[PDB]
């Protein structure tokens, strides 16, 4: 027997217990809804031929004029979120950001800070095992679109177990050829081509019979809480540009392809759903960075 | 049951064969003897 | 939480023993070796020195004892008087001592009582 | 709730002056620490929610009768709120003040074999806050110097790196380090106004939002009980 | 010989040592009192068509205004009074409401937490053992009301050994057929239907004739004391609510299918009079449970 | 093989569809409420010595003073919920109430007809089927506390299959002697007393050693939306109270001991979601109807 | 929603006189009638609500193209407020009034034999509310009177029970019965109780609260028409006149 | 010879003939538009600390003022709007919202009904059909993006045929290696990396060697007429959310990864220009829900 498991499953790592609390995560819809209208004020700047509506919007965030002679940095909020983005990867980041700073950036302005307002849905598929008898070849490539090609090198039929775990809300099969697929003890039903599963309803065989490989592609959905400003779009911008500039490199620790495959593999884990409030925040904090460091780059 | 001191946890804890003198010497001995 | 549990089958005697250390209480009960069905491992109690659990779960040690049955016994009733001014590391290396390698304790009032 | 009030490192000393060993030891027998539970969070999950058990949580836990668990209660408090169980120390070892068992040699207890390293890890350090940090860095570096280890907590510090960005700046013996401290160390103080009256997922977190939102109505009315108790002693 | 027991009373778990003192009693005491102020203001609030008879409650209950973004689920009330019910059930649920919390929410209200005021009945019967001959077959199935069958097939007549647990106060004894039933030492009596019996006389012996099997159904009253404020309706809604949200799933537990049995088994256990004591808060707890959920629903 | 399923789970007949919309569940409730009063205008009664609270409940009650040459009978609010009872059994009873009688009526007190503001908890056991193979004997009996009784005359130990539903949430098994019950395809424990299972889980296999017979005692808990005046102890009386005076004697139904097994027949029952709230809105009526009819026998 | 609103005999009978056929006759597809389907109430449930669709729903449903359908069309738009799917029935059939096409041999439609208790069957007449199911029966009566067939509607009667007890009275000839009645055949109207904005589980139950609603709507609208307060203001050949009678009545 | 074709493009299930006139239209546009000022609403009530705009917006939506202890569900807009969604995707879903249900919601805000304003760009590879030799081995899987897997185990060189149908607009296809490809009965060129192609210009021939697999990667695009207010972002997140609820769980119907491979299976089946209007009606109601349970949400 062979056992079969997606690369971006494999081994999460602990990630950050601090900068969770109630005044920590206005600090980061505060940074996010300043952020926002750095973005906006320089586009107004732009059109209206006028610098004005920029350096109200630095003011606000960076606490200081804009110099022409000085580097445009943020200020003290940049420094902050850089450092609570840090903190949230992995537990051996320094966190050494006061609470009297991150305090007085939460009155800047006022928002919630409540991460449960809303709901996001993640695209990565996990398959957690997949279990094939003797003589037959399982490969599994992809995390959005996870492709599993099977080839059957033995003299009858064999029979293929998928686990998807019992997170994903939903996950489509789809494949190369139609095939016939059914859960633990029940009959098998006529072949075609897609199959609409439900994670929670039991591992499921797959018919593999002889001869040409058969490929099944899987999509799935996941929703996961998240506040209202969540935006996939440029939460994804900033987990690239954060691994650019070097805010996860530290030691003991796994890389993502993206915030898609990071916020999953972290769901899966055992005593998963402890992390998954954290990565939703730092999801957000790069929501923040993505906006910020167009803004002003360095 | 009453609270548990340390006592019984050091007793049961690895020691360095190798850095100790003491231990080494009694190793090579009953390996010679064998 | 530091709990221990010895089972003392002699194959030199008709008696077996239970000693039990649940933090700084000990309790001990003498079995008969003798008349056991299939089911459990341990005759009637002869003498009672407390409540002994032996269902608890964890790792076995197997060895062999060095010393009879009353020599453990007399042992373990001196331990007992002993059990409020005595450190548990000690209560511990005196008894394995004395079961494993038939060496007396250093204290000489315990040695005494015992 | 008043030693986690206190926002400087003269404030905190004077504080564990006037403080004995007492308030620093709980009475309630608690639970063992570092167990793996799960907890009801029903704000936000239907589920249980996983979570671990540790000393520097607010609730008092079984400590052990070592000096090592009297070290442990007297930082917990100082960290959390709330010492830990362990019973019979003795009348006059309790009577003592705080400060006087860390930087003392007249209370009669040995802390020399203490390892930093070890109590660092009992206390779980990797979950503690900067601010908590700080206070535990207080605590060693007052055992250390009435030991002769100031060497030790020196190199101590130069193998974890992120302790010594924090480490407070005063050195004990000398009166012009304390006056001179700015360190802040208010893990609760008076709230700003956008907190509000929810739970929190960690048992650490919720515990310290707790006293947090208590602190107000705590600071009101506490003089008046404390002396109508106080007074005809 | 053969040993038969009854089901719920073997290895009642370990119950929570914490949250025991007078101030915790004063804490369960107003959150029982408190819900039930909200689940009457919901009734008000539904006939009137207005939500000023709820906001006044709930702002009670959790020192918080409902707002119409967030969700009611009861506030830090709430939060405290499910993780001590876990807490009382089993010593390995840990013990996570700090003490400032306790003592801040039992100050909303003036009440004495006193929980021996009042008695309360409970029905669960205890067959501690019942030891038969080899050539018989004894079968105990029930606890509300205990079936005992039993089949004789050797050639003499039986005596079958009942043994009922010194705590219940007294037990019924009816058979399908008429049947004798006597202390241990004592002459046999005429075969009748009904027996009552007091458990702390002894163990009693009953005579088996070869023949067609003989079924005993027995029922059992136990007073235990409780505070005023006790509900058996209540208390066993909230029982079943709390299993079926996962309250009771803690590691090495037994389950039981009411609240009768649960405190029943605890009693009869080692060091059954300190459970009792901790199980009766824990009905209380149970009961403001059941109220603060049927106000405040969750589909 | 033999199959045994619970006898109260048999064939639910359909019930009524009248009946059920807003206007006619606030005439229900102000029944319920006025119900109410009329009970405890009885007690007020005997304080003042006097009968004038009684004829202020039964005026509001009835539309009519009480008169001492009649039975007090409840005038149009008792005939209009006698008859609504009637149609919410069964769906061949006639729907005889006009909505303009049931318009007047409901308009006698402010009430919402809301039969989902609270949940209450019922006990009946429902077993779907218990497959056994052959050689074996398997009998269930009761409701509120189900005995499996199975002997097998076997040479060697059977398995035998549960099937609790999926409707139910928890559901108890206690034996007479310890057994061994796991899910399919799992590994089978130590032989253990008391068994906690979720129907949902899937099918459960008993292992019944040859000899003595074995008995497992079932018990269940369901959670069913109802209104917050909901009250079990007043809805089971009105049931029994129903049954007797003739309001369930129609042509081709089924009859059941409680309203426990009442509710649960239907809601396992094809398309049992439906009947749910049908069987809600007669059991607050029911509840009227107890509290109406003992404070004015007939 | 307006025939739904008429609350007497003679107001419902007017109504039908200057009512064509083709407001009973729906020009959307609909869906086919009896199906059992899943429908969803995100208010109760989070899982899809088992239902069955029929012909007495307030949604169009396909028809068949016979003379069962047109009558079953015409008792379901007076019943439930809409019809069936049953195109090309013609201009001279679609011109005249519903009244007519009951009452009348002139339309040059035939219809002696329908069957009551299948056309009764196929209307669900179990699922009718004691307003619908006399509305029902006035269109039997009046069926039954233009095809000389009064003694099966009364053996009719006589076969259900229920269907006796609240059948209307009155003469299909005489316009002294019409004024005399009394019956109450409002299923919208002005509410006593509270009506809330709120849905319903059955699809009936749902669409007949839109039309309560909307008929609420309908009444404090502009298109209203307000007796007392603008009766000079109408047109005297359909003012309101106590000497009312319809045609040959 | 061998035929493989797309797994996505296989059996278009019909889709629904109701709720596609202008009143209609127009319904589904209000409630995109009054979807659109409830998620906008509940960020300003994030901002100001003030439930007013959200109260405001869920008003004209619900046409019901919030109470708390009543579950926020957008009132009977929400009712209207979800069962319409599946009466588009199945012809066998039921029709049970009624005409003045939408026309009373169509007149809430005033908006146009168009539906052929704009456009947009759908990136779903159609392939008809492949049919290949009987020594050679073709695999295809992907729809966004899709990769054809080409083996020949015979003697020498074979032709494989690819048909991409007769809607996309352009085709490009990049090969692992280079290789041939032309048009019938026309000369092969040169081998090449990359192919820009027309799907009208006809069946493709492609010249497999024989030896190492040769894997082509097709991208398409297709232009297909949508309403101004159409966004691609919001229209997938719904059509995930209706799958999750369960909205799409029909009899005898297909489900599909992602809306651009609905909409291009529908284009491909026959009478496809009717299927892709309604589609496109379905792909805004879609947009109106996301915006609708993202702004209300059920843990």
């Known amino acids: 027997a062979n056992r079969a498991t997606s690369a971006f499953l494999d081994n999460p790592h602990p990630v950050g217990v601090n900068y969770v609390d109630e005044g920590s995560r206005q600090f980061v819809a505060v940074a996010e809804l300043l952020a926002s209208k750095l973005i906006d004020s320089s586009r107004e700047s732009d059109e209206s031929n006028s610098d004005v509506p920029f350096v109200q919007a630095y003011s606000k965030f960076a606490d200081d004029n804009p110099r022409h002679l000085r580097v445009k940095t943020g200020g003290k909020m940049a420094n902050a979120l850089t450092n609570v983005i840090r903190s949230y990867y992995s537990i051996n980041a320094p966190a050494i950001v006061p609470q009297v700073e991150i305090d007085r950036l939460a009155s800047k302005a006022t928002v919630s800070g409540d991460m449960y307002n809303s709901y996001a849905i993640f695209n990565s598929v996990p398959i957690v095992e997949v279990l094939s008898p003797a003589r037959t070849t399982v490969s599994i490539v992809g995390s959005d679109r996870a492709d599993v090609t099977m080839l059957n090198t033995g003299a009858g039929a064999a029979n293929i177990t998928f686990n998807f775990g019992q997170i994903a809300e939903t996950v489509i099969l789809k494949g190369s050829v139609p095939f016939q697929l059914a859960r633990l003890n029940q009959p098998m039903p006529a072949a075609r081509f897609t199959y609409k599963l439900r994670p929670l309803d039991g591992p499921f065989i797959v018919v593999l019979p002889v001869g040409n490989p058969l ?45 898609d495959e990071f916020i999953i593999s972290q769901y899966h884990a055992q005593d998963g759903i402890n992390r998954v409030s954290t990565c939703v925040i730092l999801g957000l904090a790069l929501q923040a960075y993505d906006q910020m460091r167009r803004a002003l780059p360095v | 049951r009453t609270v548990a001191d340390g006592t019984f946890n050091s007793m049961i804890m690895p020691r360095a064969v190798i850095a100790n003198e003491r231990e080494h010497f009694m190793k090579t001995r009953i390996d010679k003897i064998e | 939480a530091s709990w221990q549990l010895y089972v003392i089958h002699p194959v030199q005697g008709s008696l077996g023993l239970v000693v039990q250390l649940m933090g700084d209480a000990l309790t001990y009960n003498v079995f008969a070796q003798y008349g056991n069905t299939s089911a459990s491992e341990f005759g009637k109690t002869v003498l009672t020195g407390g409540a002994t659990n032996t269902a608890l779960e964890g790792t076995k040690v197997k060895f062999q004892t060095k010393v009879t049955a009353q020599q453990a016994l007399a042992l373990t009733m001196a331990l007992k008087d002993a059990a409020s001014m005595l450190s548990q590391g000690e209560l511990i290396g005196y008894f394995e001592q004395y079961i494993n390698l038939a060496l007396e304790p250093d204290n000489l009032s315990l040695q005494d009582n015992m | 709730m008043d030693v986690l009030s206190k926002g400087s490192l003269k404030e905190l000393l004077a504080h564990l002056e006037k403080t004995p060993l007492e308030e620093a030891i709980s009475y309630r027998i608690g639970t063992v620490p570092y167990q793996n539970v799960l907890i009801s969070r029903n704000e936000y999950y239907n589920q249980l929610y996983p979570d671990t058990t540790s000393l520097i949580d607010g609730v008092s836990r079984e400590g052990q009768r070592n000096v090592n668990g009297l070290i442990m209660s007297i930082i917990s408090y100082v960290v959390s709120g709330s010492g830990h169980y362990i019973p019979n120390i003795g009348f006059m070892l309790l009577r003592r003040s705080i400060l006087d068992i860390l930087t003392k040699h007249d209370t009669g207890l040995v802390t020399n074999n203490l390892n930093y390293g070890i109590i660092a890890r009992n206390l779980t350090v990797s979950k503690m806050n900067c601010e908590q940090r700080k206070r535990m860095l207080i605590c060693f570096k007052l055992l250390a110097y009435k030991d002769g280890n100031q060497n030790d907590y020196e190199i101590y510090l130069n193998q974890n790196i992120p302790l010594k960005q924090i480490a407070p700046n005063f050195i004990p013996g000398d009166m012009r380090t304390v006056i001179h401290n700015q360190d802040q160390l208010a893990i609760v103080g008076i709230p700003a106004y956008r907190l509000t009256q929810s739970t929190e997922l960690s048992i650490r977190d919720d515990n310290a939002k707790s006293y947090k939102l208590g602190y107000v109505d705590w600071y009101n009315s506490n003089s008046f009980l404390r002396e109508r108790s106080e007074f005809n002693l």
Do not use: C, H, W
Request: zero cysteines.
């Open chain 1, 215 to 259: 490929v099944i592609s899987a999509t799935a959905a996941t929703r996961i809480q998240v506040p209202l400003a969540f935006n996939k779009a440029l939460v994804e911008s900033g987990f690239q540009t954060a691994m650019n500039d070097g805010l996860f490199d530290i030691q003991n620790v796994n890389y993502y392809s993206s915030f």
